[PDB]
Structures are given as structure tokens and as C-alpha cells.
Amino acid sequence: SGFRKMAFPSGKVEGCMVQVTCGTTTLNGLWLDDVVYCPRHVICTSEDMLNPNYEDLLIRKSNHNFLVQAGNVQLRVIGHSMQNCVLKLKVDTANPKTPKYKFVRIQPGQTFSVLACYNGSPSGVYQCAMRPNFTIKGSFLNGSCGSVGFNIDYDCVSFCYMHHMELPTGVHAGTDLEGNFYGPFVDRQTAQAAGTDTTITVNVLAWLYAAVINGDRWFLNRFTTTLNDFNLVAMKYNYEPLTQDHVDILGPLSAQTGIAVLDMCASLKELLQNGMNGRTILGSALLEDEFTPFDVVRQCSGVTFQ
Amino acid sequence: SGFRKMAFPSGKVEGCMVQVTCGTTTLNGLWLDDVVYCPRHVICTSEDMLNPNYEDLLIRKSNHNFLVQAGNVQLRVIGHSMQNCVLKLKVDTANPKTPKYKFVRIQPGQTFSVLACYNGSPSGVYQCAMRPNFTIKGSFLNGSCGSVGFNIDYDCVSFCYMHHMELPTGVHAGTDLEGNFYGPFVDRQTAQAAGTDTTITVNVLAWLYAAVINGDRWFLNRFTTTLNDFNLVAMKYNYEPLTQDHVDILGPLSAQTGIAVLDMCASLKELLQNGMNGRTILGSALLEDEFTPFDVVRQCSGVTFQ
Ligand SMILES: *C(=N)[C@@H](NC(=O)[C@@H]1[C@@H]2[C@H](CN1C(=O)[C@@H](NC(=O)C(F)(F)F)C(C)(C)C)C2(C)C)c1cncc(Cl)c1
Ligand SMILES: *C(=N)[C@@H](NC(=O)[C@@H]1[C@@H]2[C@H](CN1C(=O)[C@@H](NC(=O)C(F)(F)F)C(C)(C)C)C2(C)C)c1cncc(Cl)c1
Structure with missing residues (x-):
């Protein structure tokens, strides 16, 4: 837990991170296969950034104007182009660590x-x-x-x-x-x-489910509410609307905890109207909205990556 | 910021993480050079864990009782020993990714x-x-x-x-x-x-300095306090004592912000006695104590690792 x-x-x-230097500006690039991606504003000087014409600025650049450092190994730039707001620096070596x-x-x-x-x-x-x-x-x-x-x-x-x-x-x-x-x-x-x-409502609900899974239950209650009546409260407190798709996405968490989605909405409604009264949830005194339902399932079930 | x-x-x-299996128990091991480290309780069965004699349990084990999986490559165990509460599994391959x-x-x-x-x-x-x-x-x-x-x-x-x-x-x-x-x-x-x-006082102070560096200042005040008088409040609120060494460690942050350490202690004292009155610090409504002064300097200055 x-x-x-x-x-x-x-x-x-x-394994993909490299250093890109142009003029006096150094920043990070992402090296995948034989291309290094970086913000195009690397080509801008201080006064260039006031109002830049990037096409004009880039045509005046040369492959050798771009210094790419992959660790303590220089990467030879053999081509350059702009794709929207990023630069694509063609290099002579494909990153052997490309995932x-x-x-x-x-x-x-x-x-x-x-x-x-x-x-x-x-x-x-x-x-x-x-x-x-x-x-x-x-x-x-x-x-x-x-x-x-x-x-x-x-x-x-x-x-x-x-x-x-x-x-x-x-x-x-x-x-x-x-x-x-x-x-x-x-x-x-x-x-x-x-x-x-706004506050990401479906995430707050996901985090409340994570709390219940981890033994925080004080904010629970027998009350329920309707989706429309919850969304009236959400709008009031600058939360974004909950959709039926959100309710569906919360299904697995609802089933694992036995707390109906709309019941947990009633809990959230009470939390919004009354605050926490000095109590905490998962070590927070604020309603957390940066965990998705997926994140909660990942951490309250245990999926790995290889 | x-x-x-x-x-x-x-x-x-x-690059060091491997899977260690013994009997029906699988857990993680740390593979450095030609040794895999893992919790010794890997050798225990359900009933073994009620009250185990690990020396007895290990003498009954064999090198071949330990299955080590490094990705999709089996590692041949050629030796085993116990060091306090970890097992050292000698393997026939040194980890080429050993940092x-x-x-x-x-x-x-x-x-x-x-x-x-x-x-x-x-x-x-x-x-x-x-x-x-x-x-x-x-x-x-x-x-x-x-x-x-x-x-x-x-x-x-x-x-x-x-x-x-x-x-x-x-x-x-x-x-x-x-x-x-x-x-x-x-x-x-x-x-x-x-x-x-208890709450790690020096860390809370470090995090308050991080807050000031990031533009949260509402909890500041002209008041100051003495170390002894702060520590009377700390003890009251289950905070651990602040030492002169803590004050010294906070020096760089004090100098960077212009807020004397003892002044920030006065701020913390007020926060402990009055709460936050609905306001937040660095997105938290609680006093955070899991950032050290080093962590704050790292993130509010910008040190990397290679
Ligand atoms: C990246 N290494 C650095 N950011 C920049 O150089 C970007 C870049 C150029 C200016 N700028 C800014 O981030 C500024 N922000 C702005 O919104 C604005 F440009 F001024 F409008 C500012 C004042 C923070 C330096 C462009 C916007 C393209 C950077 C990135 N992240 C944090 C920090 Cl502290 C610096
Ligand atoms: C590791 N993969 C797993 N932990 C264990 O198997 C450890 C281990 C044996 C039992 N145990 C426990 O963590 C239990 N905790 C205890 O305090 C006690 F043993 F029961 F006393 C329990 C009941 C949580 C399973 C020993 C203590 C050596 C594990 C690790 N971390 C989290 C979880 Cl959910 C499981």
C-alpha cells in the first residue's frame, strides 16, 4: 500500500538526452535514431526573441552552427530543418540507445x-x-x-x-x-x-478511490447524488464537469472499493462545501487532482514496464 | 522555478534490477558486479516466517534453489551467503551495467x-x-x-x-x-x-525557504525568535529540536533569500500556532517535511548528474 x-x-x-548549442545558447535535445529534436528558439539571440522570423533566422544558419554533445562525444550535424516549433537536427550517428x-x-x-x-x-x-x-x-x-x-x-x-x-x-x-x-x-x-x-474532477475522484483503497474512509457517507446535481456543485467550485465517460472510467475503482461513483461524488460534494475540518487524505489537506484513474489502478494493483 | x-x-x-526466485517466492534483487543482493526472507515459506532460524533455513538451501532472472536471461548462481538480513547470491556473470x-x-x-x-x-x-x-x-x-x-x-x-x-x-x-x-x-x-x-523541523524550514524562492511570502513577518524559544514551540507541536548545526546548514538558503534563519523560525512558529487560514504554500495546505536543505538547493539552483 x-x-x-x-x-x-x-x-x-x-539514453536519449543530448546537449544542443547554437551561438551562446545551450539547451537539451532529444536524440532518437539519427535526429536530434530541440526547441527552435535555440537559434535565437536575446534581441531575436523579441519578435523572431524563424524561417529567416534558420536559413542564415549552417549545419556547423549546431554543436551537439552526447555525453563526452560530439555528434556531427549533417542536416537541419524546422518542424513547427521544434528543430530537427540530422546527425551522422543513430542513437544506439534509441528505445x-x-x-x-x-x-x-x-x-x-x-x-x-x-x-x-x-x-x-x-x-x-x-x-x-x-x-x-x-x-x-x-x-x-x-x-x-x-x-x-x-x-x-x-x-x-x-x-x-x-x-x-x-x-x-x-x-x-x-x-x-x-x-x-x-x-x-x-x-x-x-x-x-479548473480542477480535474475525474482525477480528484480517482484519488479519493486511492484513499479508500489505502484505508482513508472518514470522508465517506451514505448520501448519494445525481450526476446533474453533482455537476452544479462542480461548476460552483471551479471543477470541470463530470461526464458519463468519466463515470465509466471510474468503474473498476468503484467495483474494487464497493463505493458507487455517484456516492463518491456525494462525498466530494460534501468535501467541497465543508472542507476537511482539520483532517487529511493520503497525507494531503487539499483535494489532489494530478492522478488519473489509470495512475491509481497502476499504483493500487502493480503494473511494471520492460 | x-x-x-x-x-x-x-x-x-x-540496469541492476533482477528477479530472484526461491521456492514459490519471487522478489527483486540488486545485481552489482557478480553479486545479487536480496532480502533473506526470500528463503522462507509462509510457516517459516512465523519464527525463522535463518542460519538453519539457509544451510538447507543449494545454489540451484536460487533462480535469478536478469531480463530474459537466466543468471547461474554459483555461491550464496547471508550478511545480516540480506542474501548475497554469487553469480557467474558480472553485471556489465554496474555503475x-x-x-x-x-x-x-x-x-x-x-x-x-x-x-x-x-x-x-x-x-x-x-x-x-x-x-x-x-x-x-x-x-x-x-x-x-x-x-x-x-x-x-x-x-x-x-x-x-x-x-x-x-x-x-x-x-x-x-x-x-x-x-x-x-x-x-x-x-x-x-x-x-515527529516532524523533521529543519526540512520544514528548508521548504519554507523554497517557498520564498518561488514567490510565496504571505507567511513571512518582521518578528524573530530565539532558538530556545522556537524549540519550546517545536516540542509542543511534535517537531524535533532545531540545532545550531541545522541553523548553519540553512545558512545558504538564508543568505539567498535574505530571511534570517531565526526569522523563518518565527514564521514557522506562527504557522504552527495559527495554521494557514485557508492559504497554501507551494501547492500544499500542510507543512512539508520531506525536502532537505540539500534538496532545496538542488532544485532552486540546478545540479545535474552524469
Ligand atoms: C529554457 N532553457 C528557458 N526558457 C526560455 O529561454 C524561454 C524561451 C524564450 C524565453 N523563455 C522564457 O521561458 C521566458 N518566458 C516567457 O514566457 C516569455 F518568453 F518571456 F514570454 C522567461 C522570462 C521565463 C525567461 C521562449 C519563450 C521561447 C527556461 C525554461 N523554463 C524555466 C526557466 Cl527559469 C527558463
Ligand atoms: C515483499 N515483497 C512483501 N513483504 C513481505 O513479504 C514481508 C516480509 C515478511 C512478511 N512481510 C510483510 O511485509 C508483512 N509485514 C509485517 O510487518 C509482518 F511480517 F507481518 F510482521 C505483511 C503483513 C504486510 C505482508 C517480512 C516481514 C520479512 C511486501 C512488501 N511491501 C508491501 C507489501 Cl503489500 C508486501
Whole structure:
């Protein structure tokens, strides 16, 4: 038992991380087969980032303008192109550590692991959710750009995120691995800001089920509620709507605990209207929304990856 | 910016994880050079675990009684011995992925990363603290025994923990890698229980400094306090004493934020006496004590590992 914010083992991604330097900017790249992916703003200078024309900036670059460091081994760049907001650096060596992988784009509300990196050297791993407003509450310092987010499904790494920028509230914005931003953000220095967020209701319910599985039951009750009446309360407290599909997705957890989904919604309703009254759930005094139903099943059943 | 419970990249440990089977019990082993380390209770049957004489149980075992699986490759056991509460299985192949490593024993209050594993297959990574009562609040299911805890310092893995057992409160007990239990726990089925815990004061202060670095300041105040007067409040609220050495260790964070250590103690005193009044710190409504001053510097400055 127990419930931790658990990331996927990072080894398979660690073997792909490289350092990409252009001019005086160094950031991280993802090396898969003979291509290194990195944020295209690597080609920008300080004043370039005020309002950049990336096509113009890139045509003025040369293969030799890109220094790629894989550990203590230089990688020779033999081609370069732009795909949306990422750069694809063609190199003369295919990464022998390339895992089986996919490029997937995730939904707000879904979670992933982040391998935070500096100078192509992994520093730490942690679990994030894609917020409803398409930001992530990460932990990133200068030089972290190009660090990637991912999930692992048996042996295949599904890359879903690459870090580009920090917004003024301290949250983070980036792209999928085809270079398309998550959310209404751009890789230039504007006054862009996150925009209003909501709480991921289905995840809160999943985490309440994890709590029951782990012996926290004080918030339970005999009351029930209807989906429509729950969603009136959700809207009130800035939670997003619960759909029938969410109810279906929570089925396995409902069955394992014996607590009907709508019953647990009644519990959540009471928690929202009354607070916790000094008590905690899974060591938290706040309602946690960055565990999906899948994450809960993973940790409260025990699936591995190879 | 941002502050996450961040684990070390797990790759170097993933390459050491193997499956150890004896009889009908399968658990995880740690494969370094030509030795596989695992909990000695692997040799016990259900009724053996009621009150086992491990020397007697092991003399009745044979090298061929131990099946070691490294991925889809069997490892031939050529020797076996007991070192305190771990088994050392001598195998005919040295692990080619053996990192530089050390066996270190940590102090309560210190943190480490755990690579949770099942059938020698890593499942997830997360960050733990050694509680003052020598338990850890982990996330472990059946088959997780032999999963290890560790820290990484540049390129060297300092193994500090191997998982043995779950206590009735859902917390976890285990050994260092020489097989010596953390805390007053034994690898047999008694009525053993965790025993009273305290809050790691120096860590709470470190996390308050992380909060200030990340822009949370509402809990700050002009008040100060003396070390002795703070420690009277600490004792009251089941916090452990703050020493001058703790104050010294917090020096760098104090200097980076401009908030004197004893001033931040005054802030903590007010937080303990008044609560948070509906506000949060670094996304928590509770005072967090599983980040050390080192962890805070790591994440609020940016050190990597290779
Ligand atoms: C990556 N190593 C670094 N981020 C950047 O260089 C990105 C990048 C260029 C500026 N920038 C920012 O993150 C800034 N953020 C902005 O929203 C804006 F550009 F100013 F509009 C800022 C002020 C945080 C430096 C572009 C947006 C494309 C980085 C990444 N993550 C965290 C940190 Cl501290 C730095
Ligand atoms: C490991 N794969 C598994 N743990 C065990 O088999 C350990 C082991 C034997 C029993 N045991 C326990 O964890 C039990 N805990 C006890 O405190 C006691 F033995 F009963 F006293 C129990 C009841 C949880 C199964 C010894 C203590 C040496 C395991 C590890 N972590 C979590 C889980 Cl769910 C199982």
C-alpha cells in the first residue's frame, strides 16, 4: 500500500538526452535514431526573441552552427530543418540507445513523467499533469528547455511534451514532439499568461478511490447524488464537469472499493462545501487532482514496464 | 522555478534490477558486479516466517534453489551467503551495467529515491524521506521486496535502502545494503509497529525557504525568535529540536533569500500556532517535511548528474 506521486523509470529517456548549442545558447535535445529534436528558439539571440522570423533566422544558419554533445562525444550535424516549433537536427550517428518510441499528444487532465535536464545531463524525474489550461506546474530552471515529458507502456516510450518556456506565474508551457504548442502559447517573448484553470474532477475522484483503497474512509457517507446535481456543485467550485465517460472510467475503482461513483461524488460534494475540518487524505489537506484513474489502478494493483 | 518532489534519474539503478526466485517466492534483487543482493526472507515459506532460524533455513538451501532472472536471461548462481538480513547470491556473470556505487546508511530526516520494482522489472520512481522513527512512507505492493532506495552524486549511486516489509499502518521498513534494519524492526512476522513519529523541523524550514524562492511570502513577518524559544514551540507541536548545526546548514538558503534563519523560525512558529487560514504554500495546505536543505538547493539552483 501507500500512494506516491510516482514517475516512470527514466532510464530509456536518459539514453536519449543530448546537449544542443547554437551561438551562446545551450539547451537539451532529444536524440532518437539519427535526429536530434530541440526547441527552435535555440537559434535565437536575446534581441531575436523579441519578435523572431524563424524561417529567416534558420536559413542564415549552417549545419556547423549546431554543436551537439552526447555525453563526452560530439555528434556531427549533417542536416537541419524546422518542424513547427521544434528543430530537427540530422546527425551522422543513430542513437544506439534509441528505445521503441512514439510521438503522442496528450489531453489536459492526463499525466506524464518529466526528465528535467541541463546541458544534456538528466537532473531529476517527476510526475506532472497537463492542466486544463494547457500549462504544467513543473520544476524547471534556466537551461531546462528541451527536457521532455513521456509515458512508458510496457517497453515503448510515448513522448508527449518538450519544454519551451516558463510563464510569469511560474508555470510552464511547451510543445508536443511534432512542435505544436500545448495551449495558446508562442515561442517569443510576449506578455502571454496562463489563463484561468479548473480542477480535474475525474482525477480528484480517482484519488479519493486511492484513499479508500489505502484505508482513508472518514470522508465517506451514505448520501448519494445525481450526476446533474453533482455537476452544479462542480461548476460552483471551479471543477470541470463530470461526464458519463468519466463515470465509466471510474468503474473498476468503484467495483474494487464497493463505493458507487455517484456516492463518491456525494462525498466530494460534501468535501467541497465543508472542507476537511482539520483532517487529511493520503497525507494531503487539499483535494489532489494530478492522478488519473489509470495512475491509481497502476499504483493500487502493480503494473511494471520492460 | 517551481518545486516538485523530484527523484534522481533511475537509469543506473534500472540496469541492476533482477528477479530472484526461491521456492514459490519471487522478489527483486540488486545485481552489482557478480553479486545479487536480496532480502533473506526470500528463503522462507509462509510457516517459516512465523519464527525463522535463518542460519538453519539457509544451510538447507543449494545454489540451484536460487533462480535469478536478469531480463530474459537466466543468471547461474554459483555461491550464496547471508550478511545480516540480506542474501548475497554469487553469480557467474558480472553485471556489465554496474555503475560506480557505494553502500551508505542514511539518517532519519534524509531523503532518497526509490525504484519500485516487481519481478525484477522497474515500475516507478519516487522520492522518500527516512522518518525519525526509521520507517518510510513508500508505495509498495506485493512483490516489491528488494526494491532499493538510493541517491546519485555526479556519477556514483549511493544505495541506502532495500525494502523488506510493510508495517500495519501502511508504512515500510527495510535495511541498508549491508542488511542492517533501519529502526527496531525484524524480518519475521511479529506484531511490530512503527512507533511514534515527529516532524523533521529543519526540512520544514528548508521548504519554507523554497517557498520564498518561488514567490510565496504571505507567511513571512518582521518578528524573530530565539532558538530556545522556537524549540519550546517545536516540542509542543511534535517537531524535533532545531540545532545550531541545522541553523548553519540553512545558512545558504538564508543568505539567498535574505530571511534570517531565526526569522523563518518565527514564521514557522506562527504557522504552527495559527495554521494557514485557508492559504497554501507551494501547492500544499500542510507543512512539508520531506525536502532537505540539500534538496532545496538542488532544485532552486540546478545540479545535474552524469
Ligand atoms: C529554457 N532553457 C528557458 N526558457 C526560455 O529561454 C524561454 C524561451 C524564450 C524565453 N523563455 C522564457 O521561458 C521566458 N518566458 C516567457 O514566457 C516569455 F518568453 F518571456 F514570454 C522567461 C522570462 C521565463 C525567461 C521562449 C519563450 C521561447 C527556461 C525554461 N523554463 C524555466 C526557466 Cl527559469 C527558463
Ligand atoms: C515483499 N515483497 C512483501 N513483504 C513481505 O513479504 C514481508 C516480509 C515478511 C512478511 N512481510 C510483510 O511485509 C508483512 N509485514 C509485517 O510487518 C509482518 F511480517 F507481518 F510482521 C505483511 C503483513 C504486510 C505482508 C517480512 C516481514 C520479512 C511486501 C512488501 N511491501 C508491501 C507489501 Cl503489500 C508486501
